[PDB]
Amino acid sequence: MPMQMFMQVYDEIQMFLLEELELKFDMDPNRVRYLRKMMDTTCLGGKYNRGLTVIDVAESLLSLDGARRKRVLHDACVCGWMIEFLQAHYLVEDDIMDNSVTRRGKPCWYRHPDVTVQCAINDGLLLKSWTHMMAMHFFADRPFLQDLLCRFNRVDYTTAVGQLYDVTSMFDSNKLDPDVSQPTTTDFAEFTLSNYKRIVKYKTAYYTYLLPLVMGLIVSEALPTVDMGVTEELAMLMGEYFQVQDDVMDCFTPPERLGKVGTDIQDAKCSWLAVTFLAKASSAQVAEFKANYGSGDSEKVATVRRLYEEADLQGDYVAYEAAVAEQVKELIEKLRLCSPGFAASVETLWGKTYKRQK
């Protein structure tokens, strides 16, 4: 059922935005059609975990007239599309930054035959413009509007800061200087767990975990009823683990199941696998990694992969996952004490995360 109201609201949103462009922005039906295709290609096709979480948190909190339920759940649906549109935006631009080929078993937006890279960049930011435009339209008379926008913008900013951490992680930050060219790091001295945890906290955790929970609480008018200290701890922990999962799958999960080809090795990313391998590797193994990392050459890539399985990384992953589950279980119970319906929805979100195959 939630998927049904969600997809009805997508149409509501799509119609408001495309008709506004027709009527107030002088747009021709040729471009309206292009934008319609763009929206559908970029915003649909996923599992909508972020947006569906907003709905579930809302449905979990309606208690702590059936008109209110209808209004609150519609508000949640709009909020859910705001995060789905935001991630739509993030992924269009990220695929460009990461030189990716496919996404959900289709070409990346910028990789479509009639999308130029310069138009893809612009399309990507229109997606983010729509997130604000939809909020202002659907929530114009809602008192939570200001708080919602403020929190949403902070999270977006947080994510762009994390993207900076990601995209500059393979350059020696002491040598960071607009005026001087610098090659990829050769010593990898910054590929540390502490540095990994920072990239992933900022670029993933806030928008993937905190934001949906927070938006769910806002449309419920229930925010100040939860322990926000514990909520953020939980969001940071699940968010980190989610990105470790993403990083592991990038290397080890068949692209046909993932829907996308991995680029982290080629792009010389500070992944979970890279940091954890380098922390434990022999000098000999580090030498071979350095000789093979961050190149498109397919044997070099397979070398890195071999090194990873040689150093029992999957063993380290299982142990990390159990340590995470342990901490997540504890925090949910701390949450259960004063917010049992909210704690229930966090458990459901955790259930969508723990040991996902995707």
Q: Per the annotation, does 114 bind a ligand?
A: no
Residue owning tokens 């701390």: 334
Q: Binding to a copy of itself by residue 164, rule CB under 8 A?
A: yes
Partnered with residue 102 across adjacent β-strands are 107
Residues 6+ apart with CB under 8 A from 96: 108, 110, 117, 120, 121, 124
Least separation, in Å, of the C-beta of 63 and ligand 714? Answer: 33
Q: Any idea which residue has 């150093």 for tokens?
A: 311
**Alpha-carbon torsion angle 217, 47, 35, 29, nearest 10:** -100
Subset of 214-253 contacting Mg ion (CB under 5 A): 246, 250
Asked if 352 interacts with a copy of itself (CB under 8 A), we say no
114 binding a copy of itself? (CB under 8 A): yes
Q: Which of residues 61-90 bind ligand 714 (CB under 6 A)?
A: 90
Q: Within 173-212, which residues bind a copy of itself (CB under 8 A)?
A: 173-174, 176-182, 198, 201-202
Answer for which of 56, 59, 94, 156 binds Mg ion (CB under 5 A) is 94
Distances (CA, A) of 151 to 136, 156, 161, 205, 342: 14, 9, 15, 14, 19
Rounded to an integer, what distance in angstroms lies between the CA atom of residue 328 and that of residue 56? 19
User: Is the CB of residue 132 less than 8 Å from the CB of residue 187?
Assistant: no
The position carrying tokens 């949450």 is 335
Which residue, 9 or 88, is less far from ligand 714 as judged by CB? 88
The tokens describing 192, both together, are 């540390």
Q: Report the residue number, 243 or 345, with the smaller CB distance to ligand 714.
A: 243
Binding flags for a copy of itself, 122-151, as an x/- string (CB under 8 A): xx-xx--x--xx--x---------x--xx-
Q: How far is the CB of 269 from ligand 714 (least distance, A)?
A: 7
Interaction between residue 121 and ligand 714 (CB under 6 A): yes
C-beta of residue 343 within 8 angstroms of C-beta of residue 336? yes
How is 209-270 classified by DSSP, letter by letter? IIHHHHHHHHHTT-GGGS-HHHHHHHHHHHHHHHHHHHHHHHHHS-HHHHSS---TTTTT--
Block residue for tokens 């990105």: 243
Q: Which range binds a copy of itself by CB under 8 A, 163-171, 221-229, 242-250, 284-292?
A: 163-171
Between 98 and 172, CB nearer to Mg ion: 98
For position 110 contacting ligand 714 by CB under 6 A, the verdict is no
Name the binding residues for Mg(2+). Answer: 94-95, 98, 166, 246, 250, 264
- Enumerate binding residues for ligand 714 (CB under 6 A): 90, 93-94, 98, 121-122, 124-125, 159-160, 163, 203-204, 246, 250
- Enumerate binding residues for a copy of itself (CB under 8 A): 21, 25-28, 30-31, 33-34, 37-38, 41, 93, 96-98, 109, 112-116, 118-119, 121-123, 125-126, 129, 132-133, 136, 146, 149-150, 153, 156-158, 160-161, 163-165, 167-168, 173-174, 176-182, 198, 201-202
